[PDB]
Coordinates of C-alpha atoms and ligand atoms in Angstrom, one line a residue:
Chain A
X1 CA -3.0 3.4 -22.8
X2 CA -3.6 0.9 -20.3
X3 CA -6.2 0.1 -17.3
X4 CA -5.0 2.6 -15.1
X5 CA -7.5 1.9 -12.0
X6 CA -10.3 -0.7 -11.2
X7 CA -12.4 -1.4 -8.5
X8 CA -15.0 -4.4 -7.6
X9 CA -18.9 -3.8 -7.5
X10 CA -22.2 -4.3 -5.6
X11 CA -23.2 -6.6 -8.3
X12 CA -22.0 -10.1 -8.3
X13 CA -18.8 -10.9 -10.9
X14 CA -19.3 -7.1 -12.1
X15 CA -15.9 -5.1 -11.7
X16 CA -15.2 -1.2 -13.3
X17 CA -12.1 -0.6 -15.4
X18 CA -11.0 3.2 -15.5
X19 CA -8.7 3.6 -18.9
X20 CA -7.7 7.5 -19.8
X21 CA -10.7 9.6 -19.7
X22 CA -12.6 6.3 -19.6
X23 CA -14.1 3.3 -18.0
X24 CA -16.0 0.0 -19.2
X25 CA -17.8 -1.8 -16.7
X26 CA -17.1 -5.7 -16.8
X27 CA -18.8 -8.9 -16.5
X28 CA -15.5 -10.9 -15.5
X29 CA -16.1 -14.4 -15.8
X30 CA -13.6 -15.2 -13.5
X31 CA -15.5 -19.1 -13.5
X32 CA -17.5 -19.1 -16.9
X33 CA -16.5 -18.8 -20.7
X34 CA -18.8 -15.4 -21.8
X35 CA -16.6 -12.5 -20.1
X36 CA -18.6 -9.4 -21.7
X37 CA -18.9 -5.4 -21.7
X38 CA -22.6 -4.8 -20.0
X39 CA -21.3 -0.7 -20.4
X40 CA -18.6 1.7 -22.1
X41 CA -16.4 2.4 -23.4
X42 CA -17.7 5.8 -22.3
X43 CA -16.0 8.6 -21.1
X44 CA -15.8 9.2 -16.9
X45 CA -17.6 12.7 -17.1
X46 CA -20.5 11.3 -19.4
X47 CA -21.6 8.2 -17.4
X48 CA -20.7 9.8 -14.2
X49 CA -22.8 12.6 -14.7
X50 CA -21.7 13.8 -10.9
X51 CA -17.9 13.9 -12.3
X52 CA -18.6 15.6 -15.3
X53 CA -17.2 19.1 -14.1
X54 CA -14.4 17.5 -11.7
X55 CA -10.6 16.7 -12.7
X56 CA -12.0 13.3 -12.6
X57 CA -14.5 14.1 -15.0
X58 CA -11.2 16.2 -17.6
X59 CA -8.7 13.3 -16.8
X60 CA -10.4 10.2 -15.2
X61 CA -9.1 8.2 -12.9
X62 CA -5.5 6.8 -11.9
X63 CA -6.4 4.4 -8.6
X64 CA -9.1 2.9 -7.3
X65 CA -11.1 1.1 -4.6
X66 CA -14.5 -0.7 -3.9
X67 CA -15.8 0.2 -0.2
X68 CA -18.9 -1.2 0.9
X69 CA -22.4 -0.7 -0.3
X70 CA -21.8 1.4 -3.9
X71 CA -19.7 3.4 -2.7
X72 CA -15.8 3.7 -3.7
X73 CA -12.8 6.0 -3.5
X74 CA -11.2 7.3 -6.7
X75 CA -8.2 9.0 -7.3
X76 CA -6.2 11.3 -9.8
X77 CA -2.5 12.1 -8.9
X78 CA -2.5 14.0 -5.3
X79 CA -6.2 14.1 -5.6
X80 CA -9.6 11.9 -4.6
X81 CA -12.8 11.3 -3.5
X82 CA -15.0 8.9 -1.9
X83 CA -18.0 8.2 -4.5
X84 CA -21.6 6.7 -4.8
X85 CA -21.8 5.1 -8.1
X86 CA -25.1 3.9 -8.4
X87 CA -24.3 0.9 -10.6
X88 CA -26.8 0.0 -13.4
X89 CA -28.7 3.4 -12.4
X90 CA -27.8 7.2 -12.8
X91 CA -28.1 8.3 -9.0
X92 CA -23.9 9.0 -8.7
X93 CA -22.8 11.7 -6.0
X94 CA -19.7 12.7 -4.8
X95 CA -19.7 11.4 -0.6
X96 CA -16.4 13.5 0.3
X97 CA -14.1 15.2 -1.7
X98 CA -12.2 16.1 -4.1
X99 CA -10.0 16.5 -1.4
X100 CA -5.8 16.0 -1.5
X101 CA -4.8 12.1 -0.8
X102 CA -3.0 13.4 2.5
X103 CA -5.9 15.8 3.7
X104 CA -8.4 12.1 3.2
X105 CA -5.6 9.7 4.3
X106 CA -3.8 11.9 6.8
X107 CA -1.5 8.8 7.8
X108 CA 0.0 9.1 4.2
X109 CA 1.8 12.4 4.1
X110 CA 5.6 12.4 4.6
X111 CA 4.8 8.9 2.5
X112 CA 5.0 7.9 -1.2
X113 CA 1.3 7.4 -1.1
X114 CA 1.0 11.4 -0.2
X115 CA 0.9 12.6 -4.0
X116 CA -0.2 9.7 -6.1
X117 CA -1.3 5.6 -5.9
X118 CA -1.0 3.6 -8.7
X119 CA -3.6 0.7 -7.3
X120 CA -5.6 -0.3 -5.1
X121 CA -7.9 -3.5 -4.4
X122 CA -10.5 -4.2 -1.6
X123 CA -9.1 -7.0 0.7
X124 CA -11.6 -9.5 2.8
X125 CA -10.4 -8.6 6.6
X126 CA -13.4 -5.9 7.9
X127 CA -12.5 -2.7 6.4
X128 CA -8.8 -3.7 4.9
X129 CA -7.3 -2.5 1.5
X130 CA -4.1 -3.2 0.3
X131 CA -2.6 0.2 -1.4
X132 CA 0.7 -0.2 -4.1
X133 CA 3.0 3.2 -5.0
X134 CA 6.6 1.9 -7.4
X135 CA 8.3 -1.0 -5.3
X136 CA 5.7 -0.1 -2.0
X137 CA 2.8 -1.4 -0.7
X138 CA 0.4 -0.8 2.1
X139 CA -2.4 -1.8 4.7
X140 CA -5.0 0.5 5.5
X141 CA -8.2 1.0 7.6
X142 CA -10.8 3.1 5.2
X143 CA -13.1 3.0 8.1
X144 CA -10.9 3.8 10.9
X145 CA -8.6 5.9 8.9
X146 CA -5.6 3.8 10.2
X147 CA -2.5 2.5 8.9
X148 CA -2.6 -1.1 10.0
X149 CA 1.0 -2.1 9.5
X150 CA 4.0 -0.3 8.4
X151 CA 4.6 1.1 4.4
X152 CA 6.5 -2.4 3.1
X153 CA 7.9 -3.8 -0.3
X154 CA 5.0 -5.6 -2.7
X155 CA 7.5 -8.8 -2.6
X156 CA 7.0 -8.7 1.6
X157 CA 3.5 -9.5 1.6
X158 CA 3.3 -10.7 -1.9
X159 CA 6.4 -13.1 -2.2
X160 CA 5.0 -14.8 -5.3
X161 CA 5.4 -11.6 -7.0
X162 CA 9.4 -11.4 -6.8
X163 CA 11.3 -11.7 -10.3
X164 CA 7.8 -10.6 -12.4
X165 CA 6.8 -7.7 -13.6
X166 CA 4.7 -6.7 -10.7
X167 CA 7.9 -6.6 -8.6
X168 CA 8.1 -2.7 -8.9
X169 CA 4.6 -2.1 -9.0
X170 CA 0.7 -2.4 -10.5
X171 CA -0.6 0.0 -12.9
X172 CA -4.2 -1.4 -12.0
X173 CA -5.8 -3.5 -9.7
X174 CA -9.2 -5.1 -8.3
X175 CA -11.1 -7.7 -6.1
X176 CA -13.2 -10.5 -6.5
X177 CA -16.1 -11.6 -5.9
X178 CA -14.1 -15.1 -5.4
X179 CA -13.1 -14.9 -1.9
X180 CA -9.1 -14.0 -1.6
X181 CA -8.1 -13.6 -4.9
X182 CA -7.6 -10.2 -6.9
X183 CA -7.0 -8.8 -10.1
X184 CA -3.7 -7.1 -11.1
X185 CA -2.6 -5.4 -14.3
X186 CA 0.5 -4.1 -15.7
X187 CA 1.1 -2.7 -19.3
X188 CA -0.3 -5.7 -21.4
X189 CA -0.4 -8.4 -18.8
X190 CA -2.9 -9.7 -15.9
X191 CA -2.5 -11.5 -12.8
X192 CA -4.7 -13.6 -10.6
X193 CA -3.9 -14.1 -7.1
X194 CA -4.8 -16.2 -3.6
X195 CA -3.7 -14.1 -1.2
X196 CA -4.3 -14.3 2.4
X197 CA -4.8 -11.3 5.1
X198 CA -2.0 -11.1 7.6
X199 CA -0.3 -13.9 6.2
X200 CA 3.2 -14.3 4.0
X201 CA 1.4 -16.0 1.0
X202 CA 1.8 -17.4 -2.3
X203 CA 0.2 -18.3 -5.5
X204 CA 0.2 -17.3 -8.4
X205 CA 1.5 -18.3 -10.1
X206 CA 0.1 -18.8 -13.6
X207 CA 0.8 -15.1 -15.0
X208 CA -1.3 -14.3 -18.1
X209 CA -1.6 -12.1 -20.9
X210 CA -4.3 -9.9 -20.5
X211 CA -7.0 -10.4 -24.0
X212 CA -5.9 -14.1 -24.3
X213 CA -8.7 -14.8 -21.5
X214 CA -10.1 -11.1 -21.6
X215 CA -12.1 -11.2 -25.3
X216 CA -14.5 -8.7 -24.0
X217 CA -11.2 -5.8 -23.8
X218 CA -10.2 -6.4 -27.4
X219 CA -10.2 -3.1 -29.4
X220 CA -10.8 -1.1 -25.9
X221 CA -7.0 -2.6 -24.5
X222 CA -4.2 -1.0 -25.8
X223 CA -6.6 2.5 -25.9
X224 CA -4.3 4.1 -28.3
Chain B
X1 CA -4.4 34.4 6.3
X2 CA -4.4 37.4 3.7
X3 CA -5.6 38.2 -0.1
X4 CA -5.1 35.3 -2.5
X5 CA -6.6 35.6 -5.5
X6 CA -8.6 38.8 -7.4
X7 CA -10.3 39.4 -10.4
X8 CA -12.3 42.7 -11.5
X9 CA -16.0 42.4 -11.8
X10 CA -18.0 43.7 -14.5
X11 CA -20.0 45.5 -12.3
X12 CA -18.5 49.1 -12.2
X13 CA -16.7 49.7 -8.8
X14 CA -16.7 46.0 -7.4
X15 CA -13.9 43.3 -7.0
X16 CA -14.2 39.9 -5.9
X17 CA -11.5 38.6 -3.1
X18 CA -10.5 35.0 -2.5
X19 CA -8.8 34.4 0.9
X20 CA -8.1 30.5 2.1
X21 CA -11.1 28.6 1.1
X22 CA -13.7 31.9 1.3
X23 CA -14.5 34.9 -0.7
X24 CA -15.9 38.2 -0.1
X25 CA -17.8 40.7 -2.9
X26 CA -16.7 44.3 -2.5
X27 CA -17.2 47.7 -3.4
X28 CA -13.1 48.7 -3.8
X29 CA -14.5 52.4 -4.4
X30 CA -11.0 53.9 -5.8
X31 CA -12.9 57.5 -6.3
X32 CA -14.1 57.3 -2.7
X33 CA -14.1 56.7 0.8
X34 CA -17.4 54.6 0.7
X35 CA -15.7 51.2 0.5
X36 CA -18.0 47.8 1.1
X37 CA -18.3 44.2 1.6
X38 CA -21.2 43.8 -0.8
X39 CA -21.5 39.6 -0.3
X40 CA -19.7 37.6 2.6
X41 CA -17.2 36.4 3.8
X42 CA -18.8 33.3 2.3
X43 CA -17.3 29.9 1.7
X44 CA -16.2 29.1 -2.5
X45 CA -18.5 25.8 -2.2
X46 CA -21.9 28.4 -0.8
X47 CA -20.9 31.0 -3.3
X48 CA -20.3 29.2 -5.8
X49 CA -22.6 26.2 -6.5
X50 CA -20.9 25.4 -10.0
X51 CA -17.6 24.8 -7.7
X52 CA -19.2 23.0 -4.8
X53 CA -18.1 20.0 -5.7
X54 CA -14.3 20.8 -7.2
X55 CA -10.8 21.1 -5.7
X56 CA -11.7 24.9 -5.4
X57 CA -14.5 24.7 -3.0
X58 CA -12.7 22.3 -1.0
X59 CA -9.6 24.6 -1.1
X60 CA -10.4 27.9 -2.3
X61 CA -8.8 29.7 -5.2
X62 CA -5.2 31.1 -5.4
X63 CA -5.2 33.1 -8.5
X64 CA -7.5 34.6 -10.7
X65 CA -8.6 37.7 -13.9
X66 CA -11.2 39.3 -15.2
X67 CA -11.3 38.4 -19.4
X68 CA -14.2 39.9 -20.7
X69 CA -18.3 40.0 -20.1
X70 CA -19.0 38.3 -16.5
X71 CA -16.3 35.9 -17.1
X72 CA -13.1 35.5 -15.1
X73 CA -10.1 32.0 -15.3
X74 CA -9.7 30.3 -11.5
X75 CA -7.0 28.6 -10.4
X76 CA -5.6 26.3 -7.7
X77 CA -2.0 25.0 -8.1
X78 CA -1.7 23.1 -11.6
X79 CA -5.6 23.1 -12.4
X80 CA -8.0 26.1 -13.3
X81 CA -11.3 26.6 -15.3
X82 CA -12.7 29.2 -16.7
X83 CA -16.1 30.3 -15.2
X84 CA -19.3 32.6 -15.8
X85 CA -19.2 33.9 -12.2
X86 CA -22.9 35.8 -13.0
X87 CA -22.3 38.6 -10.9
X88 CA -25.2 38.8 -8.3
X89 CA -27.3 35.7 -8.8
X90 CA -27.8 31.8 -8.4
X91 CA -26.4 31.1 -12.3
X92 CA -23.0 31.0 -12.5
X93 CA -21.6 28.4 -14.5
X94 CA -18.1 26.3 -15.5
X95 CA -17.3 27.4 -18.9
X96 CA -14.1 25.4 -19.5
X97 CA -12.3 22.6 -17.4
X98 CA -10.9 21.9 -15.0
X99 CA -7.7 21.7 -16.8
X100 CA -4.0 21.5 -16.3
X101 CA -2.4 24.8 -16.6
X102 CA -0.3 23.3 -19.5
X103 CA -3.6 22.2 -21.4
X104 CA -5.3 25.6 -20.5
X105 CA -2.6 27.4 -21.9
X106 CA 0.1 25.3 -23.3
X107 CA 2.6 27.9 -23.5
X108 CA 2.9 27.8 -19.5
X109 CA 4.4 24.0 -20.0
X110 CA 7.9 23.8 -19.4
X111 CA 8.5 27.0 -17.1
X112 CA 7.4 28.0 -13.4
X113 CA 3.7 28.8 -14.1
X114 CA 3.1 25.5 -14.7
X115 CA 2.5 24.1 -11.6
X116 CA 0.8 27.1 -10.0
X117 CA 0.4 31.0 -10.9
X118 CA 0.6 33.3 -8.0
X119 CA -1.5 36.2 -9.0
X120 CA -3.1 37.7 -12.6
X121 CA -4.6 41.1 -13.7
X122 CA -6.6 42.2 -17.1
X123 CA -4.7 44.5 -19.2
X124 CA -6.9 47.3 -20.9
X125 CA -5.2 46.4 -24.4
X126 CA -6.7 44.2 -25.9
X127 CA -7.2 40.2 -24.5
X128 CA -4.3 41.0 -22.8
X129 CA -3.5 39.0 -19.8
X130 CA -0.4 40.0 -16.8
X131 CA 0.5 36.8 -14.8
X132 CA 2.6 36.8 -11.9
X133 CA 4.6 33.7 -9.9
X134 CA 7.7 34.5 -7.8
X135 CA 9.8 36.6 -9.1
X136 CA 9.1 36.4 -12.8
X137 CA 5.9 37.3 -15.0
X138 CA 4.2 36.8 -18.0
X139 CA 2.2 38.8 -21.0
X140 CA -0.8 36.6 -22.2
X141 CA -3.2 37.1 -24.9
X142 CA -6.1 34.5 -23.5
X143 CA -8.1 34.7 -26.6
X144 CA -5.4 33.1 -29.5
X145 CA -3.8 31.5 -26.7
X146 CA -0.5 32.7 -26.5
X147 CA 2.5 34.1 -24.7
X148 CA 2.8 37.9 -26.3
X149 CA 6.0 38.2 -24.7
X150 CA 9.3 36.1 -23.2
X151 CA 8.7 35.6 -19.4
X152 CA 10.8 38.7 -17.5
X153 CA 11.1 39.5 -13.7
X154 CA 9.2 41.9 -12.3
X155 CA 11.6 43.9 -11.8
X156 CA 12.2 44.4 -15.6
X157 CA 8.9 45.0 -17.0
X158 CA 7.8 46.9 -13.3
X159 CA 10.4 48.9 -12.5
X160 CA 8.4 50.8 -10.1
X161 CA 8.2 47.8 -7.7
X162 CA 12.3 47.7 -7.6
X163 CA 13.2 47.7 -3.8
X164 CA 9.8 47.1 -2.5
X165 CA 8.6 43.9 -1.2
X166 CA 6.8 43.1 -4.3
X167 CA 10.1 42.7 -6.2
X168 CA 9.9 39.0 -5.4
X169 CA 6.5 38.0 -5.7
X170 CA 2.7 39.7 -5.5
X171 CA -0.2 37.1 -3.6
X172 CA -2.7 38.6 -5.4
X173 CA -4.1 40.7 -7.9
X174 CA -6.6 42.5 -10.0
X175 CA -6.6 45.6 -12.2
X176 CA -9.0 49.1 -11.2
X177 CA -12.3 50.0 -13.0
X178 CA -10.1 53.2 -14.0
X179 CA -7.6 53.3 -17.1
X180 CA -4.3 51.7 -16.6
X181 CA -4.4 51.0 -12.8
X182 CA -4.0 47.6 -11.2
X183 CA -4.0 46.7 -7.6
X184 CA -1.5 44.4 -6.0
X185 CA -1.1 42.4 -2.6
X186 CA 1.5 40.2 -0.6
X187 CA 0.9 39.7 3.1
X188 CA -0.8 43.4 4.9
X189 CA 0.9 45.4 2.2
X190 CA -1.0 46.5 -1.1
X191 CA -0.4 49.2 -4.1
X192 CA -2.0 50.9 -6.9
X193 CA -0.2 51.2 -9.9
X194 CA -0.7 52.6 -12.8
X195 CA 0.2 50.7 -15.7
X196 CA 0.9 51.3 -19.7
X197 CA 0.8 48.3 -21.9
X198 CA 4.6 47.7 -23.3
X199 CA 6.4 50.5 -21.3
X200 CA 9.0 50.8 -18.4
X201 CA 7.0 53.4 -16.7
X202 CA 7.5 53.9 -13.3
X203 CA 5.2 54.9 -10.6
X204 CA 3.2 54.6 -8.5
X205 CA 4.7 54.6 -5.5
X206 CA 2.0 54.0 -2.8
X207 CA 2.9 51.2 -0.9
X208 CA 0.6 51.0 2.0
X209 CA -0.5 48.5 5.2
X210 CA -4.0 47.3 3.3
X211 CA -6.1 47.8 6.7
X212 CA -5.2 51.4 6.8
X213 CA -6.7 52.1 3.6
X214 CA -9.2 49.6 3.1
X215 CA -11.5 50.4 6.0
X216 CA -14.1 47.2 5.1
X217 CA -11.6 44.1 5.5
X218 CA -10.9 44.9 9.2
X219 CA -11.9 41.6 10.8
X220 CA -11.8 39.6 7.2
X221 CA -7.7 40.4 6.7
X222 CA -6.3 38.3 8.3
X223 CA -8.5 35.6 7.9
X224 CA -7.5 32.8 10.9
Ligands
MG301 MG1 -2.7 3.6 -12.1
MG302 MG1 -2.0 33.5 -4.9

């Protein structure tokens, strides 16, 4: 029982970490020693009070996405939403949705994308996100509802991936606040990456175990 | 664009109808002529403000049954909840879920109803629950939770729908205000049957075109 979907927020170095029914939100420290839980563990349907009668609110959530303002999209298997989640406040309300990933992403049916994402993060190009399914990844306009580039392999557009574990996929990922880099998390393991928008880029580079620099998810990672 | 999902109400003489995304309340009137659309055709989400928000406003319902009091299990592919549906007013309520099928009723995991039921009707024994999806159905008992009953075809626990189009699947379903009679749907066609708990009795045979006989869904069935 891993991080199974995150997404960046409206607050600065604040991300949202959706484990099983649950989430925690995060004070990352991606620059500064004193990473720390301002929130959760607490289960999706009772801090989201919107989601408490939803799938989202019986399962959680299994991919996820920051938009703009606090909004964000978040998924369960063919299913999602587009959310407002009202950070540090109680205001949360369902935008669109729950609608079926192809009938809110039309340009994903006959893809792998159609019936479940494992991760998502929020890239820096206007309204870009980068989208990952087993060895697949894709480039998508949230805004325009477009495809911008074909369905490719993660090690395409994310080289510095090839030979480690995130070769065949991410079981979690999100932004941050630090321009062009990104979060990614698989089983017990986290990466941190530079990556730059429409270019064949590297580094890193350094991959890490996750609650060797994450104190603030010991006891809460593994949630079993 | 026909019948999808039925469940008795517990208002004598009235049946609730789920076609696409939109519902209609009705006065079935088996002892008489004097048939009516009591509510609609309204959408699930208008209807039904406890599902405004869920998988079944934005998509309807595709099976359904009565269980006791003004209560009644919904369903859409793998999920369903049971609700309060608080027959003619503003407070109608989500009782349990949305679950899985398989967490709903655990017995389903493993064989077709899993991933979707096609139709349901109360039994008058009991808690008793009759499930159908394709060819095959099951005996429930909702209240302890369990299958009373290996999953047969139709055909072997119906024998009075041998060689009728219902021999290979029913769309809908719900079971009369009047002992031991159910009625059943797939495309323009319907029947009234008249059913004993554990037997092989056969008849009725009444298979008729549903617009000839239900004068109040002319310009509802088919819904474009
Ligand atoms: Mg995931
Ligand atoms: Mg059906």
């Amino acid at each position: 029982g891993y991080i199974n979907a995150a997404f960046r927020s409206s607050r600065n170095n604040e991300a949202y970490l959706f484990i099983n029914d649950k989430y925690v939100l995060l004070d990352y420290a991606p620059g500064t020693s004193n990473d720390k839980v301002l929130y959760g563990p607490s289960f999706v349907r009772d801090g989201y009070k919107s989601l408490a009668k939803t799938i989202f609110g019986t399962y959680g959530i299994d991919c996820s996405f920051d938009t703009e303002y606090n909004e964000a999209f978040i998924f369960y298997e063919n299913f999602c939403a587009r959310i407002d989640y009202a950070p540090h406040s109680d205001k949360d309300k369902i935008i669109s949705g729950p609608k079926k990933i192809a009938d809110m992403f039309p340009f994903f049916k006959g893809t792998v994308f159609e019936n479940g994402i494992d991760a998502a993060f929020r890239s820096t190009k206007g309204k870009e996100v980068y989208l990952f399914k087993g060895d697949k990844y894709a480039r998508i306009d949230y805004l325009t509802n477009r495809l911008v580039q074909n369905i490719k392999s993660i090690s395409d557009g994310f080289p510095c991936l090839r030979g480690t574990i995130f070769e065949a996929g991410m079981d979690s990922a999100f932004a941050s606040h630090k321009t062009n880099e990104a979060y990614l998390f698989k089983g017990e393991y986290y990466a941190r990456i530079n990556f730059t928008p429409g270019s064949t880029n590297d580094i890193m580079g350094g991959v890490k175990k996750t609650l060797d620099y994450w104190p603030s998810l010991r006891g809460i990672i593994p949630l079993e």
